[PDB]
RNA sequence: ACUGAAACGAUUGUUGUGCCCCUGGCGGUCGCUUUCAAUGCCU
């Protein structure tokens, strides 16, 4: 539905009978959630959010976390400053290119 | 039926339009066609 998933319902499918009228794509009732959740605590646009172009980056552990560790990773995900490229750049060509420097800069 | 069978990111499009290798410039300056010569010899 044009309501709950992200993107678009109603494009062609591999999973739906070739030639059918069933021109709609299925979605387990989970993931029905999953979507809603993501409307209702990302809030992003139903039907429409994929035009966005979005790329998801997935910062998984190396195993394991410690407790301050994933509270560190809340803070991060939550928080983190939408990155505008211009200013990476110029605290870079400043400080003689040594990648160092960008540790320090306003991330959140 | 290989999460399968068939599967064009395609169609159209001028690196375009204007533009003076331009302006100025003495082949110039100096230079004796010169030097020597019996219209001559006899009546």
């Known amino acids: 539905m044009d309501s709950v998933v992200l993107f678009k319902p109603q494009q062609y ?14 979605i387990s009732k989970i993931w029905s959630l999953e979507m809603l959740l993501r409307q209702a605590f ?17 910062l998984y552990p190396a195993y394991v976390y410690a407790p301050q560790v994933v509270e560190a990773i809340r803070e991060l995900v939550y ?11 110029k ?18």
């Open 13 to 26: 499918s591999n999973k739906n009978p070739l030639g059918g009228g069933q021109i709609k794509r299925g």
């Open 79 to 89: 928080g983190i400053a939408s990155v505008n490229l211009w200013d990476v750049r």
């Open 42 to 58: 990302w809030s992003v646009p139903s039907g429409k959010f994929e035009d966005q172009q979005p790329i998801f980056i997935y």
């Open 91 to 108: 605290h870079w060509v400043n400080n003689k290119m040594d990648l160092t420097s960008l540790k320090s800069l306003p991330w959140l």
